[PDB]
Amino acid sequence: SNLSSEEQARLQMQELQKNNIVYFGFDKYDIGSDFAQMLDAHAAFLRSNPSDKVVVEGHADERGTPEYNIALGERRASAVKMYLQGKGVSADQISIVSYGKEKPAVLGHDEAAFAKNRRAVLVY
């Protein structure tokens, strides 16, 4: 049906709240085609709401040392930022934080834990 432009933003945010994670390859920090549509929806939202900022989380797997794992975390959030920047989102609206391997989603040493910890999360 046709909605009020108010709960239209509500439903919109819900989609942005739900699907804010870009998953990465092992040691790979390039954005896949799957999240393009996803990020293109984040971008359109952000530059329509100039006074709203997103923070991108950077995450690496257990392998490596915690301090150097920061490096892999930042470049993954940088690709996300750059993609949104290409779509027109201002640097003003974005800041990135890399945690390295400090905040896992899953625990263990199975690849299942690894693959889902190799992520880039967008928090509003």
């Binding site: 923070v55 257990e62 392998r63 490596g64 301090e67 150097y68 920061i70 890399s98 945690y99």
Partner: protein, 406 residues
Amino acid sequence: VRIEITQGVDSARPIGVVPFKWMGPGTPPEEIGAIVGADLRNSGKFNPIDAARMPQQPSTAAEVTPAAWTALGIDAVVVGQVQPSADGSYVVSYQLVDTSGSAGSILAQNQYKVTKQWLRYSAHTVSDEVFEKLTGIKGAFRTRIAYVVKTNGGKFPHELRVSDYDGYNQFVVHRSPEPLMSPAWSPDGSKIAYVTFESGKSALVIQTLANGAIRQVASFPRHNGAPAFSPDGTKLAFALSKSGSLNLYVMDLASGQISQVTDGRSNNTEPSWFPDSQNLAYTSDQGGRPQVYKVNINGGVPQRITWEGSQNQNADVSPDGKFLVLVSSNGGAQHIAKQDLETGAVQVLTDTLLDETPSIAPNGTMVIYSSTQGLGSVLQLVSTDGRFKARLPDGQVKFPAWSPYL
């Protein structure tokens, strides 16, 4: 319950530590003989034997039977005593007794008067002398360790803690809803630098333990991390990724003036100080997968110093400046390896999963690092020659840091 030895060195030097004579009714709060004995077994240099195999249990060096000891192969005996005051404080006494001869000769003597709180320190104090007296190498039993504990719940899951080197006298330094990283000791032992994410972004700060106050040192855009105090304490090194990548900086603590150590588009982090406090060892990927590099804070161009293995990070330089201890990764696995800085001979010290964050005791005898078990991480111990392995225990523990002498 005491530290767990995983791999005991059977060739350890036999020593007999005798239960100290408690001069009073009931029991003493602490037993010095039980702690001092463990400490020497903890060091991995000595093999203290149980009371069942002791020919005697004397208090003073005048009741010693040398022949009864050298027959066991014990060449020295530690006798002691505990005398209470009328204040709830106590007097500790000890003697190091040589059994190789006609007379039971004393090598060391001391008396300590302490309150009940400081009783373990007394055993540590005795140990630091006896160990040093026998070996010539200064003991590190009156040292501490600083670690981070991650509980999987509560309002405050992240805690920076400190205990005695053996895990006793544990207390919390910082409780944070958000993660804490990489605690680093000051050369005295009164201050500690670490990274805290309480604001939402990373921050590098310094807490004076005695009062629990906070000095903010760096909160630049992007990660502020990896603190290292120079052995003299004059300046602190760290890495900032504000530039676009992690590169090293050093700060003159007194002035507060800030200087850039490293120029790169590459990543340079995890700084470890050389004994001169003019040279830094650190991790760098200027060559591709990261290796450990060396540069002078004054001036110079970075050189690779790790020449064995495909990947080497997170190194700690020994105080005397003789060797390196780092995370050597080859073909998926990673273990704590030691490197002779003159010889070049690289030796893997560990067999465990995902070894990282190693630290070196002030006398460069022992290594404490972090290993992964199950869903959590545990602190580990390994002698610098790898002949002695041990375990160390709440929630999973990380980021061990060993105190300087104190």
